[PDB]
Scaffold this active site. Structure first.
Site, short mmCIF file in Angstrom:
data_model
loop_
_atom_site.label_atom_id
_atom_site.label_comp_id
_atom_site.label_asym_id
_atom_site.label_seq_id
_atom_site.Cartn_x
_atom_site.Cartn_y
_atom_site.Cartn_z
N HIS A 148 0.83 -1.22 0.00
CA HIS A 148 0.00 0.00 0.00
C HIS A 148 0.84 1.25 0.00
O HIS A 148 0.69 2.11 -0.87
CB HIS A 148 -0.95 0.01 1.19
N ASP A 204 11.47 22.16 -24.46
CA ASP A 204 11.38 20.86 -23.82
C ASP A 204 12.19 20.90 -22.52
O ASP A 204 12.54 21.98 -22.05
CB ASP A 204 11.87 19.71 -24.74
N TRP A 240 6.75 -0.12 5.31
CA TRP A 240 7.48 0.60 4.24
C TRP A 240 8.85 1.14 4.67
O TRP A 240 9.63 1.57 3.83
CB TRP A 240 6.62 1.71 3.62
N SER A 291 15.48 6.69 -11.12
CA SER A 291 14.47 7.43 -11.85
C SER A 291 14.32 8.86 -11.32
O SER A 291 14.39 9.85 -12.10
CB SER A 291 13.12 6.71 -11.73
N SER A 292 14.12 8.97 -10.01
CA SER A 292 13.87 10.27 -9.38
C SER A 292 15.10 11.17 -9.31
O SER A 292 14.96 12.39 -9.42
CB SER A 292 13.21 10.11 -8.01
N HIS A 318 12.12 11.80 6.06
CA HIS A 318 11.47 13.06 6.30
C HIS A 318 11.46 13.98 5.04
O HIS A 318 10.39 14.40 4.62
CB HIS A 318 11.86 13.83 7.52
N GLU A 321 11.43 13.12 2.10
CA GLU A 321 10.42 12.49 1.24
C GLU A 321 9.00 13.05 1.43
O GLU A 321 8.26 13.22 0.46
CB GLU A 321 10.40 10.96 1.41
N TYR A 335 8.08 16.03 2.50
CA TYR A 335 8.09 17.37 1.90
C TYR A 335 8.13 17.32 0.37
O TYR A 335 7.40 18.07 -0.30
CB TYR A 335 9.18 18.21 2.54
N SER A 384 -1.32 26.91 -5.02
CA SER A 384 -1.09 28.34 -5.28
C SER A 384 -1.69 28.77 -6.64
O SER A 384 -2.41 29.76 -6.71
CB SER A 384 0.39 28.66 -5.21
N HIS A 431 12.66 12.88 14.83
CA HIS A 431 11.28 12.82 15.34
C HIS A 431 10.53 11.53 14.98
O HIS A 431 9.47 11.25 15.51
CB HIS A 431 10.45 14.09 15.05
N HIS A 432 11.10 10.74 14.06
CA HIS A 432 10.62 9.39 13.76
C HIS A 432 11.22 8.30 14.69
O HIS A 432 10.94 7.13 14.53
CB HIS A 432 10.97 9.08 12.33
N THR A 462 5.24 27.21 6.93
CA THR A 462 4.04 26.56 6.40
C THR A 462 2.81 27.46 6.62
O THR A 462 1.97 27.61 5.73
CB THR A 462 3.81 25.17 7.01
N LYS A 500 2.43 30.21 4.08
CA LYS A 500 1.75 29.67 2.90
C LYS A 500 0.23 29.58 3.07
O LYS A 500 -0.54 30.02 2.20
CB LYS A 500 2.29 28.29 2.49
N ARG A 505 -0.57 0.76 15.47
CA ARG A 505 -0.60 0.64 14.04
C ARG A 505 0.04 -0.67 13.68
O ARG A 505 0.71 -1.33 14.52
CB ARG A 505 0.07 1.83 13.34
#
Ligand SMILES: CCCCCCCCCCCCCCCCCC(=O)OC[C@H](COP(=O)([O-])OCC(O)COP(=O)([O-])OC[C@@H](COC(=O)CCCCCCCCCCCCCCCCC)OC(=O)CCCCCCCCCCCCCCCCC)OC(=O)CCCCCCCCCCCCCCCCC
Ligand SMILES: CCCCCCCCCCCCCCCCCC(=O)OCC(COC(=O)CCCCCCCCCCCCCCCCC)OC(=O)CCCCCCCCCCCCCCCCC
Ligand code: HEA
Ligand code: HEA
Ligand SMILES: CCCCC/C=C\C/C=C/C/C=C\C/C=C\CCCC(=O)O[C@H](COC(=O)CCCCCCCCCCCCCCCCC)COP(=O)(O)OCCN
Ligand SMILES: CCCCC/C=C\C/C=C\C/C=C\C/C=C\CCCC(=O)O[C@H](COC(=O)CCCCCCCCCCCCCCCCC)COP(=O)(O)OCCN
Ligand SMILES: CCCCCC/C=C\CCCCCCCCCC(=O)O[C@H](COC(=O)CCCCCCCCCCCCCCC)COP(=O)(O)OC[C@@H](O)CO
Ligand SMILES: CCCCCC/C=C\CCCCCCCCCC(=O)O[C@H](COC(=O)CCCCCCCCCCCCCCC)COP(=O)(O)OC[C@@H](O)CO
Ligand SMILES: CCCCCCCCCCO[C@@H]1O[C@H](CO)[C@@H](O[C@H]2O[C@H](CO)[C@@H](O)[C@H](O)[C@H]2O)[C@H](O)[C@H]1O
Ligand SMILES: CCCCCCCCCCO[C@@H]1O[C@H](CO)[C@@H](O[C@H]2O[C@H](CO)[C@@H](O)[C@H](O)[C@H]2O)[C@H](O)[C@H]1O
Ligand SMILES: C[C@H](CCC(=O)O)[C@H]1CC[C@H]2[C@@H]3[C@H](O)C[C@@H]4C[C@H](O)CC[C@]4(C)[C@H]3C[C@H](O)[C@]12C
Ligand SMILES: C[C@H](CCC(=O)O)[C@H]1CC[C@H]2[C@@H]3[C@H](O)C[C@@H]4C[C@H](O)CC[C@]4(C)[C@H]3C[C@H](O)[C@]12C
Ligand code: CUA
Ligand SMILES: [Cu+2]
Ligand SMILES: [Mg+2]
Ligand code: NA
Ligand SMILES: [Zn+2]
Lengths: 43, 98, 259, 58, 227, 84, 46, 46, 514
Positions: free
Chosen positions: I61, I91, I126, I156-157, I240, I242, I244, I255, I290-291, I316, I319, I438
């Site tokens: 998932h 391009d 994950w 790829s990324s 982390h 990731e 963002y 926006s 924090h994880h 944040t 925004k 969880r």
């Protein structure tokens, strides 16, 4: 946004068909698996 | 360490690289590498906008440091005005190639 | 006809062949590790080499033979190469992180000390120091090759570049011999793990960089480079300096401070 | 060695409509076909290997 | 334990958990205020035919909506860190108990005096006695003295686990090769439940923790009887 | 020492060649001799089956599964000890 | 009156509260009476 | 050159809406079905 | 012709389209997986009779939603379509490498599906933490296949990131500074920098996991002097950033959407928005532990990570308030896209605020590895990312296709989805606060009611998804061709018509330097 009228209009009836077929394509295979879950567990 | 045998760009550059190099030494810019300087932008003294066709997109930065760029198609014919600040732009077609 | 300076690339099969070669190499490693067969992996490695060869061949055709590398296109490639090197720096930093994590807080299973009990580190003043001089020397010679190229000197460019490549090859053979001679292995706990994975990935990068320099050697032989336009060479030189700097960090961290 | 870059420039700028990867000639077509055969054949073989690895064995 | 339809935290069993409850009340007030403010402003922006579409100056407004959030954050941070350093401060425990995670059960070791150890498994659902809790009861509970500072040491003999008891405000990961310390103090006798809180495989859901909190003298006698 | 040399004006390739042959390669020649003297196959240490070394959680995917990739019989013992 | 796909780069008509005077008129081609009406508009609107 | 304009800048045909419905149902339906059949597969092994 | 166009592409729009298609297909896989999760949990007891399968489903998932739905759609799809159009570029910088970034994804996805099919799957979460993901607790090929799946997606990324940074820096009109680029272009740029720096660290970590599993290294194995916690540091140093990465392109789209449907020529406080995104990007690299508040870290470290994490609320908030200020004074068009964006603003804010609760390590002791965290991230991610994607999709579909959607159907779809996601996830807060862990296949009896309601919610969202497919069909079936689009003067992507020609900006825009 402005657009032209539909080139190949899709009537209420045609929409019912499209919707029905879309819903069934998701529901029937999953449905079959879930209905038969019990069978799979005995194997 | 001195001696020869390495070609120069004058000798060996080809295709678009060469066309850019040659246009540059004649002080020309057919491949839009440089930013054009604005005129006063009046009806008498419009910004002249080269195109190889009958229309071109203009972006107008109305005032210095504006973050918002104003975009519109400039058509061949009478000068047109930026919809935000009113500065005049006129299309000069042919001006670029065939 | 375009009136910008950028390069619209011909449709190409190499992105797809490269991607499929990635599938074959990864699924091949899996097949090798678990279903002891090398077959997929060898197909993958073959297609990967074929892809790289044809892809980079085409870039040479586009630039040297077709003239598509305007200053704008060249500026883009410069950013591209710098960004790629940055990503490689961060890959290595992960291994440095692992090394410092393990070595700064050695666990009871190691005897609570670094180097662990039973590990006899190599002498940093023997072959590791030679390796250091070799890569540093190769940084000097590549800079000579660069300056010779820019000054239009074909022969000295070739001489300097050959020397650079020879030093790269020498480093590689020295490290292969050191690997064989080392009395610890990759299976010797976290000392072996950090040592061989970090220096091994460095070693791979040396081979890759040497290969890149060899490509530039043969391109120079065939007169591809001008005195002002030779990005392939600059890219290879940036990469080579990267390889050198990584060595220096490894040498100071693993070989010297971690002995 | 002699500088034969101009010959290559003429070859690769020839107005024959070929993409850059086939423009060197018949050898390009052959290398292409080898590469693509191995890729697709290898990919099919990987799928077979998945199929084989997906079930338990004797 | 949780009770049906519960919305908030389990009632606090330790004074640290009570601190957390009040700190959560404080923080939740701020959260409800900010989210309802945002929702209201949204509705406000969307319920007028009046318009103003020319360029708006942003400088004055950005001071307010930087400085105000900063102050709010400090107002959360101050009691947060007070509790954090409160949790960590010097304790002087009367007892040390170890717990080791396994796939999929807990073992406990009380080795200050004698060598007392045992395994603690979930009662299968088919073996529950009437009125017992599905997935929560164990065969051998963790008997502990009430109103006493206890040092718990947590580790594992296989994969990661995590030893948790929500009503005591406790959660400590169980990591092989590592010995993690937390401190436990119950204000009350009773039974206090928790569940493994790191994914450890197939039966992650099925290795609970049950503390039994009793007077010291009962603890002492239980210990001697478990040898 | 930042260095101890000093040299600018008409440098380029000539200066870098000077450094290649005057400093860089001599250093490599010196380190090559230092290494040629201070090598010589040394005493293999006594085998102790330490559990943090000679790790085998899964067989290697080559050979008999118990030999490392650059296994040197002279200096690399197996989990059971040196081969002889 | 008919707007075509080929017309995308031309100034267009829009009805918007906040853009009350659009770039083009709604009707470009006038009938004979409509042209006479535009003539009459040049005199007093009373 | 390649086809341009609506219904042509896409790797699937929209020329017939019923053939499209079929293709869309196979496409989206195969994605949605796959995890159900993987669960099934894993249940049947063991 | 077909093969040359769709398999050998060097065109940003077509590659964009491929990415959108891939992502949509991936979205169905992810949804199906989500429903199996909620089916298992929808009543007390066991449904599947096999919690290894449950754990595999949970793991798949997350990987599908993150790596195959969100990233391909936002960065690959919208990014490739919109970025060159927004800066007037012909391009991407590396149009052929662009195509490889795309084509790496189907094999990446095949590797993941292979992992679930061989042995008993990767039931790891994950995070793929050792030793559960090691060669004893997960023997066989599944975890190795998962790792390789991530390697392909990583490459790829990274290559995509290189491409985007280069394109955006190098390929704007010579007069256009970075402070004249649209906010979406900024959002992609910043996202790309995060990917470039974060993914190689992930790659290092999972490679070390690979060698622990297959080459007898012991980076994460205490027996060899390793440490499982090292893996967690490396993972989260990526992980982390990731999150963002997952939201930043969303912020960019929002926006644009809010600006457009407010009838404004520009977002409120452009430079503040740029500042906010850059600040979020930078801070996103210094908060990762924090994880790890329950792993046994020193008190001063916890204090640091608590404080630094909370700071992220400041940019944040700028925004959020700036989106509100963009609405302010607008001639509001209540289009379906606008509804998605307004839902985003509120739901993202709720999710962000539960993030701030979690930043407090003292509370996080009790909330960590509970459904409170699951509620947190399905608000910011599931809803935030998905609502931005939906809003973007509805808004730009006529640009990409040349055809209009039925707006009434689209509003119906939004309404159903809004109800569904909130019924699904809101009750999970209660589950979390009351201590439900969880990654559980079953729960103590007291948790039944909220789980029941949450699972019913999941089915409402399924109905929304099925309807979305119909809505797209109806649009392609009816073929209402776009004529005119408002506000093209501040939305350049629309100025070449719908769809734009294969080659756009062959002649570049003219922009004076004034
Ligand atoms: C452990 C040690 C560690 C140390 C470090 C590691 C060092 C190892 C280095 C190894 C890698 C070196 C790579 C160098 C490539 C040099 C090319 C170059 O720069 O010239 C530019 C060259 C310019 O040529 P041009 O004439 O100006 O015109 C170009 C036009 O395109 C038009 O021309 P074209 O491009 O179409 O083709 C021209 C081609 C002619 O074209 C053809 O007709 C056929 C083309 C076939 C291409 C083959 C594809 C290779 C990929 C296969 C991958 C699988 C591996 C199998 C290798 C098979 C080798 C055939 O020209 C040739 O004739 C080439 C053959 C030369 C023969 C020399 C043989 C030397 C043997 C030495 C033995 C010494 C023993 C002595 C002992 C004596 C004692 C008694 O353009 C290119 O060829 C493209 C260059 C692409 C560069 C990217 C390379 C990426 C590398 C990845 C693949 C790695 C494998 C490839 C090498 C295989 C080695 C056999
Ligand atoms: C975000 C949702 C959007 C709405 C969408 C609608 C469609 C979806 C449907 C589904 C919509 C259901 C709406 C029900 C709301 C009830 C909330 C509540 O009573 O919560 C109470 C607290 C109190 O905590 C405690 O310490 C519990 C002990 C004291 C109270 C209990 C007394 C005993 C009563 C028992 C019987 C009650 C019956 C059950 C009652 C429970 C009802 C579920 O619970 C907690 O701690 C929970 C903390 C949750 C944290 C969420 C943070 C976000 C802020 C809220 C966003 C909206 C703001 C805009 C303002 C809201 C405007 C939208
Ligand atoms: C889109 C994805 C995304 C985003 C943007 C975020 C944003 C944030 N998250 Fe989130 N989070 C996740 C996805 C995301 N998260 C995921 C997937 C996990 C689980 C990983 C796993 O274990 O599997 C997770 C877990 C996670 C944890 C770990 C909890 C645990 O496992 O125990 C923490 C801890 O601090 C955290 C905090 C935050 C904070 C402070 C923000 C901030 O960036 C939010 C800031 C936003 C706001 C605050 C709202 C708007 C601001 C205002 C209106 C101004 C006024 C407000 C104040 C003054 C407070 N989240
Ligand atoms: C982007 C990320 C994302 C998204 C969208 C989702 C979507 C959903 N998820 Fe989540 N989930 C995670 C990321 C995500 N999730 C992560 C990271 C975990 C942690 C895994 C772990 O612990 O290891 C997790 C875990 C998780 C759990 C906890 C499992 C456990 O702890 O045991 C549950 C429980 O209900 C859940 C349910 C759902 C549901 C019901 C939906 C949805 O059904 C809600 C409705 C949304 C949709 C249906 C999306 C539709 C979008 C499309 C179809 C694309 C369309 C494309 C175009 C238009 C181009 N997921
Ligand atoms: C402890 C373990 C560590 C292990 C390893 C240790 C060390 C590894 C280090 C290796 C480095 C070694 C060798 C590399 C040598 C040379 C390469 C550089 C060549 C060069 O000459 O770089 C110049 C600098 O540019 C540039 O940084 C362009 C940069 C492109 C943009 C980058 C953006 C991404 C980076 C994020 C940082 C934030 C950005 C801040 C922006 C502030 C701007 C004022 C080029 O200038 P240019 O005008 O862009 O050029 C023309 C077009 N490119
Ligand atoms: C000549 C210089 C030396 C280095 C180059 C030569 C050969 C190695 C080839 C490739 C190395 C590549 C990567 C490094 C990976 C693992 C470490 C291997 C480095 C090495 O070569 O270490 C050797 C072990 O090799 C081993 O196990 C196994 C080695 C081969 C199998 C490795 C396969 C696994 C590859 C992992 C791929 C994932 C990487 C993805 C990158 C990220 C992309 C995003 C050490 O020998 P030893 O006998 O233990 O000790 C010496 C005793 N006298
Ligand atoms: C024993 C054998 C083992 C072999 C294994 C190693 C195999 C392959 C890796 C070797 C890398 C070779 C790269 C060759 C690139 C040649 C193409 C080139 O260099 O192309 C140049 C452009 O640069 C460009 O694309 C710049 C492109 C640079 C590409 C960078 C390559 C790095 C790849 C590394 C991969 C890392 C893997 C890391 C694992 C974690 C062309 O422009 P110029 O040079 O300006 O020419 C034009 C002038 O002539 C005009 O006057
Ligand atoms: C076990 C896991 C296995 C995984 C396998 C890896 C996956 C696939 C491998 C297939 C790679 C082979 C193909 C070679 C790719 C060459 C890319 C390249 O060289 O791309 C260049 C751009 O990137 C640049 O410069 C910058 C240079 C970038 C070089 C990229 C080389 C490959 C990178 C792989 C490693 C990435 C990072 C690893 C560390 C984290 C050129 O761009 P094009 O758009 O082509 O042309 C533009 C034209 O104007 C040129 O005329
Ligand atoms: C979580 C995803 C959403 C799932 C919700 C699915 C909703 C249900 C859709 C219908 O699915 C069908 O249900 C039938 C039963 O109603 C099944 O027939 C089964 O039962 C019939 C009557 O008992 C027999 O006639 C059939 O042979 C037997 O296959 C059939 O297989 C199945 O495809
Ligand atoms: C990132 C890419 C990494 C590339 C990795 C390259 C690794 C090279 C492995 C070398 O292994 C040697 O070669 C033989 C094969 O040439 C092996 O035969 C073994 O493997 C065969 C697999 O095909 C079996 O059929 C044989 O029976 C079996 O002896 C043998 O053990 C070993 O000496
Ligand atoms: C063949 C060529 C002749 C001059 C030219 O073609 O320009 C010369 C010039 C530089 C020479 C190379 C350089 O001197 C460097 C190498 C020196 C080694 O002693 C022989 C191989 C070596 C690799 C040389 C081979 C060959 O003689 C080269 C390449
Ligand atoms: C200087 C810079 C750019 C201004 C411009 O050139 O247009 C602006 C853009 C955003 C501004 C920042 C943001 O508005 C957020 C903060 C607002 C506070 O009022 C001052 C500090 C604060 C951190 C601002 C300082 C400065 O004025 C910034 C950084
Ligand atoms: Cu033990 Cu989860
Ligand atoms: Cu985080
Ligand atoms: Mg945890
Ligand atoms: Na269940
Ligand atoms: Zn203007």
């Amino acid at each position: 946004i402005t657009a032209k009228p539909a080139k190949t209009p899709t009537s209420p009836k045609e929409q019912a068909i499209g919707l029905s077929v879309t819903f069934l394509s998701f529901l029937l295979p999953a449905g079959w698996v879930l209905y038969h879950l019990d069978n799979y567990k005995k194997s | 360490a001195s001696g020869g045998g390495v070609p120069t760009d004058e000798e060996q550059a080809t295709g678009l690289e060469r066309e850019v190099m040659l246009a540059a030494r004649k002080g020309q810019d057919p491949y839009n590498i440089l930013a054009p300087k604005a005129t006063s932008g009046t009806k008498e003294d419009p910004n002249l906008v080269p195109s190889i066709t009958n229309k071109r997109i203009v972006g107008c930065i109305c005032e210095e440091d504006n973050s918002t760029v104003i975009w519109f198609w400039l058509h061949k014919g009478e000068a047109q005005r930026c919809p935000s600040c009113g500065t005049h732009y006129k299309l000069v077609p042919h001006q670029l190639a065939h | 006809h375009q009136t910008h300076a950028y390069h619209m690339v011909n449709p190409s099969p190499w992105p797809l062949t490269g991607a499929l070669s990635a599938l074959l190499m990864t699924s091949g490693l899996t097949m090798w590790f678990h279903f002891n067969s090398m077959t997929l992996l060898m197909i993958g490695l073959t297609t990967n080499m074929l892809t790289m060869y044809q892809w980079w061949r085409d870039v040479i055709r586009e630039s040297t033979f077709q003239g598509h590398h305007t200053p704008a296109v060249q500026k883009g490639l410069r950013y591209g190469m710098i960004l790629f090197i940055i990503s490689e720096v961060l890959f290595f930093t992960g291994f440095f992180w692992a090394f410092y994590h393990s070595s700064l807080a050695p666990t009871p299973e190691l005897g609570g000390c670094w180097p662990p009990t039973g590990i006899h580190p190599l002498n940093p003043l023997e072959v590791p120091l030679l390796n250091t001089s070799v890569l540093l020397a190769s940084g000097v010679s590549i800079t000579w090759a660069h300056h010779s190229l820019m000054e239009g000197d074909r022969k000295h460019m070739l001489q300097a570049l050959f020397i650079t490549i020879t030093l790269g090859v020498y480093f590689t053979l020295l490290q292969a011999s050191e690997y064989y001679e080392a009395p610890f292995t990759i299976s010797d706990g976290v000392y072996g793990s950090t040592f061989f994975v970090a220096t091994g990935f460095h070693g791979l990068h040396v081979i890759i960089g040497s290969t890149f320099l060899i490509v530039c050697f043969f391109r120079q032989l065939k007169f591809h480079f001008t005195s002002n336009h030779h990005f392939g060479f600059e890219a290879a030189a940036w990469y080579w300096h990267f390889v050198d700097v990584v060595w220096l960090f490894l040498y100071v961290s693993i070989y010297w401070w971690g002995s | 060695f002699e500088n034969r870059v101009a010959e290559k420039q003429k070859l690769f700028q020839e107005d024959n409509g070929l993409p850059v990867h086939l423009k060197g000639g018949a050898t390009d077509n052959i290398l292409y076909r080898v590469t693509m055969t191995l890729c697709l054949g290898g990919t099919l073989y990987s799928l077979y290997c998945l199929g084989w690895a997906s079930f338990p064995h004797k | 334990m949780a009770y049906p339809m519960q919305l908030g935290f389990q009632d606090a069993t330790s004074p640290i958990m009570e601190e957390l409850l009040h700190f959560h009340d404080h923080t939740l007030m701020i959260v409800f205020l900010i989210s309802s403010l945002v929702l209201y402003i949204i509705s406000l922006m969307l319920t007028t035919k009046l318009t103003h579409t020319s360029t708006m100056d942003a400088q004055e407004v950005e001071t307010i909506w930087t400085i105000l959030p900063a102050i709010i954050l400090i107002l959360i941070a101050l009691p947060s860190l007070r509790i954090l350093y409160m949790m960590d401060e010097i304790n002087n425990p009367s007892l040390t108990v170890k717990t080791m995670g396994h796939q999929w059960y807990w073992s406990y070791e009380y080795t200050d005096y004698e060598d007392l150890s045992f395994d603690s498994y979930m009662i299968p659902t088919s073996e529950l006695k009437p009125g017992e809790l599905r997935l929560l009861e164990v065969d051998n509970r963790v008997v502990l003295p009430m109103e006493m500072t206890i040092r718990m040491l947590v580790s594992s003999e296989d994969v990661l686990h995590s030893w948790a008891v929500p009503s005591l405000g406790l959660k400590t990961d169980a990591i092989p090769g590592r010995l993690n310390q937390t401190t436990l103090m119950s204000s009350r006798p009773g039974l206090y439940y928790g569940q493994c809180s790191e994914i450890c495989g197939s039966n992650h859901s099925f290795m609970p923790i049950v503390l039994e909190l009793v007077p010291l003298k009962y603890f002492e006698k239980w210990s001697a009887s478990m040898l | 020492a930042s260095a101890a040399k000093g040299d600018h004006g008409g440098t380029g390739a000539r200066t870098w060649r000077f450094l290649t042959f005057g400093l860089a390669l001599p250093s490599v020649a010196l380190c090559t001799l230092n290494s040629w003297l201070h090598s010589g196959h040394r005493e293999r240490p006594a085998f102790i089956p330490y559990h943090h070394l000679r790790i085998r959680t899964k067989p290697f995917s080559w050979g008999d599964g118990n030999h490392t990739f650059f296994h040197n019989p002279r200096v690399n013992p197996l989990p059971t000890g040196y081969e002889k | 009156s008919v707007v075509k796909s080929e017309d995308y780069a031309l100034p267009s008509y829009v009805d918007r509260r906040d853009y009350p005077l659009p770039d083009v008129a709604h009707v470009k081609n006038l009938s004979a009476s409509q042209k006479a009406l535009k003539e009459k508009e040049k005199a007093s609107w009373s | 050159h390649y086809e341009e304009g609506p219904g042509k800048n896409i790797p699937f045909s929209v020329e017939n809406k019923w053939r499209l419905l079929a293709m869309m149902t196979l496409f989206f339906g195969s994605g949605f079905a796959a995890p159900f059949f993987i669960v099934r597969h894993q249940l049947l092994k063991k | 012709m077909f093969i040359n166009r769709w398999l050998f592409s060097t065109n940003h729009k077509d590659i964009g389209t491929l990415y959108l298609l891939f992502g949509a297909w991936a979205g169905m896989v992810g949804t199906a997986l989500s429903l199996l999760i909620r089916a298992e949990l929808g009543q007390p007891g066991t449904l599947l009779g096999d919690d290894q399968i449950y754990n595999v489903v949970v793991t798949a998932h997350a990987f599908v939603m993150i790596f195959f739905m969100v990233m391909p759609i936002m960065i690959g799809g919208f990014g490739n379509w919109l970025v060159p159009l927004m800066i007037g570029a012909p391009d991407m910088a590396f149009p052929r490498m662009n195509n490889m970034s795309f084509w790496l994804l189907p094999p990446s996805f095949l590797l993941l599906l292979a992992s679930s099919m061989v042995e008993a799957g990767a039931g790891t979460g994950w995070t793929v933490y050792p030793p559960l993901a090691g060669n004893l607790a997960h023997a066989g090929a599944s975890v190795d296949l998962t790792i390789f799946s991530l390697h392909l997606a990583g490459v790829s990324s990274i290559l995509g990131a290189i491409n985007f940074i280069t394109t955006i820096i190098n390929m704007k009109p010579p007069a256009m500074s970075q402070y004249q680029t649209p906010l979406f272009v900024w959002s992609v740029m910043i996202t790309a920098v995060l990917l470039l720096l974060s993914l190689p660290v992930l790659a290092a970590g999972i490679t070390m996991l690979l060698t622990d599993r297959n080459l007898n290294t012991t980076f994460f194995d205490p027996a060899g002097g390793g440490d499982p916690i090292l893996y967690q540091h490396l993972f989260w140093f990526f992980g982390h950033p990731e999150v963002y990465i997952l939201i930043l392109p969303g912020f960019g789209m929002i926006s644009h959407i809010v600006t457009y449907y407010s009838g404004k020529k520009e977002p409120f406080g452009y430079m503040g928005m740029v500042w906010a995104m850059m600040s979020i990007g930078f801070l996103g690299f210094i908060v990762w532990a924090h994880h790890m508040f329950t792993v046994g870290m020193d008190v001063d470290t916890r204090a640091y990570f608590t404080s630094a994490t909370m700071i992220i609320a400041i940019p944040t908030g700028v925004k959020v308030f700036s989106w509100l200020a963009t609405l302010h004074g607008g001639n509001i068009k209540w289009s379906p896209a606008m509804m998605w964006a307004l839902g985003f603003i509120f739901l993202f804010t709720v999710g962000g605020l539960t993030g701030i609760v979690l930043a407090n390590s003292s509370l996080d002791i009790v909330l960590h590895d509970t459904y409170y965290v699951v509620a947190h991230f399905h608000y910011v991610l599931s809803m935030g990312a998905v609502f931005a994607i939906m809003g973007g999709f509805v808004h730009w579909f006529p640009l990409f296709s040349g055809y209009t959607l039925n707006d009434t159907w689209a509003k119906i779809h939004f309404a159903i989805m809004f109800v569904g996601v909130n019924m699904t996830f809101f009750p999970q807060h209660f589950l979390g606060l009351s201590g439900m862990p969880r990654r559980y296949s079953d729960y103590p009896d007291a948790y039944t009611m909220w789980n029941t309601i949450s699972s019913m919610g999941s089915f409402i969202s399924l109905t929304a998804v099925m309807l979305m497919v119909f809505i797209i069909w109806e649009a392609f079936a009816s073929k209402r061709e776009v004529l005119t689009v408002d506000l093209t003067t501040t939305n350049l992507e629309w100025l070449n018509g719908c769809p734009p020609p294969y080659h756009t900006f062959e002649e570049p825009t003219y922009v004076n330097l004034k």
